[PDB]
Amino acid sequence: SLHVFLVSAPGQGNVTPMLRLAKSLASKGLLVTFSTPESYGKEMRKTNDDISDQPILIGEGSIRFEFLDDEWDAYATHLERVGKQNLPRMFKKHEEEGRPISCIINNPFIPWVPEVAESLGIPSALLWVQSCASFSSYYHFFNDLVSFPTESNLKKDVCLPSMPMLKYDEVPLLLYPIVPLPIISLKNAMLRQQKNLSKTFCVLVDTFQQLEDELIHYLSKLCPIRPIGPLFKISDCIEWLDSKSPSSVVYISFGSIVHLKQEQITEIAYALMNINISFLWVMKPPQKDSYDKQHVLPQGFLEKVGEKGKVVKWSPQEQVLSHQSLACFVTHCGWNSSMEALANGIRVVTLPQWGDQVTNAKFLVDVFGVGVRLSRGDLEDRIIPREEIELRLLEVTSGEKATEMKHNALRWKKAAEEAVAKDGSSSKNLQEFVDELNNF
Ligand SMILES: O=c1ccn([C@@H]2O[C@H](COP(=O)(O)OP(=O)(O)O[C@H]3O[C@H](CO)[C@@H](O)[C@H](O)[C@H]3O)[C@@H](O)[C@H]2O)c(=O)[nH]1
Question: Are 3-234+421-439 and 237-399 the same fold in CATH?
Answer without folding.
Answer: yes
